[PDB]
Amino acid sequence: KKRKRCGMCAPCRRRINCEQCSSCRNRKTGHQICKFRKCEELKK
DNA sequence: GCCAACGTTGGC
DNA sequence: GCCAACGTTGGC
Ligand SMILES: [Zn+2]
Ligand SMILES: [Zn+2]
């Protein structure tokens, strides 16, 4: 089962998208979360 | 059925 | 080894 965001790290507390990062810019094709919101624990 | 975004992988 | 496209799926 796919892992879940931790809710606690600084990225998880962010509430809105930066709209300036690659992930935000390519969302339609890339399907990724804003780079500034990606959970610290889901990178490792 | 929609939607946000994780897992896999493939291009670099 | 990074990172983004694609496929997918959990929650609604
Ligand atoms: Zn962003
Ligand atoms: Zn987190």
CA–CA dist A27, A3 (Å, integer) = 20
CA–CA dist A18, A30 (Å, integer) = 16
Q: Are A18 and A34 in contact (CB under 8 A)?
A: yes
CA–CA dist A19, A17 (Å, integer) = 5
Angstrom distance, A13 CA to C8 C1': 26
Q: Burial level of A19, CB count in 10 A (0-12/13-18/19+)?
A: exposed
- The DSSP symbol for A44 reads -
Q: What technique solved it?
A: X-ray
Q: Are A8 and A34 in contact (CB under 8 A)?
A: no
The total domain count for chain A is 1
Amino acid identity of residue A31, one-letter, is: H
Q: Burial level of A35, CB count in 10 A (0-12/13-18/19+)?
A: middle
Does strand C come within 7 Å of the CB of A8?
no
Q: What is the nearest nucleotide to A22, using C1' and CA?
A: C4
Residue A23: domain span: 1-44
Angstrom distance, A1 CA to C11 C1': 13
CA–CA dist A7, A28 (Å, integer) = 24
CA–CA dist A3, A28 (Å, integer) = 22
In angstroms and rounded to an integer, the radius of gyration of the C-alpha atoms of chain A is 11
